[PDB]
């Protein structure tokens, strides 16, 4: 079902390299729904190229533009596995600490902040 599960090690790396080379200032970024949600839609997609100078605060309205939500339905958002320690960081700084050993950076959202 996940990212992980359906790319092999060789082609999630290979597949990094390949932005690294036609999209040279996106962050290449896995989104996915957290496995438990229930109230949340599903993104059209699970692959996002995010220009490298947007932060966090600016990546999570995006998201929730993306998935269409209103003002006052909840979104959390873990990095890496984790919360974020701050939104003012901006993503090239992000990704630089929290990227997997694959080169993306992965992402879960749900409505629920114990998820
Ligand atoms: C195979 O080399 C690449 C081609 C394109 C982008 C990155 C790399 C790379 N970086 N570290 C190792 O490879
Ligand atoms: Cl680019």
């Known amino acids: 079902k996940t990212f992980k599960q359906r790319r092999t090690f060789e082609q999630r790396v290979e597949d ?32 996002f190229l995010v220009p490298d100078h947007v932060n966090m605060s600016e990546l999570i309205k995006i998201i929730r533009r993306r998935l269409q939500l209103n003002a006052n339905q909840a979104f959390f958002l ?15 700084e992000v990704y ?11 992402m879960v959202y749900a409505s629920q902040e114990t998820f």
């Open 96 to 106: 630089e600490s929290e990227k997997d050993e694959d080169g993306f950076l992965y």
């Open 78 to 92: 873990l990095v890496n596995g984790h919360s974020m320690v701050s939104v003012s960081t901006p993503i090239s």
């Open 16 to 47: 990094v390299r390949l932005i690294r080379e036609q999209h040279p200032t996106k962050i290449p970024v896995i989104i996915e729904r957290y496995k438990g949600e229930k109230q949340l839609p599903v993104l059209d997609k699970t692959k």
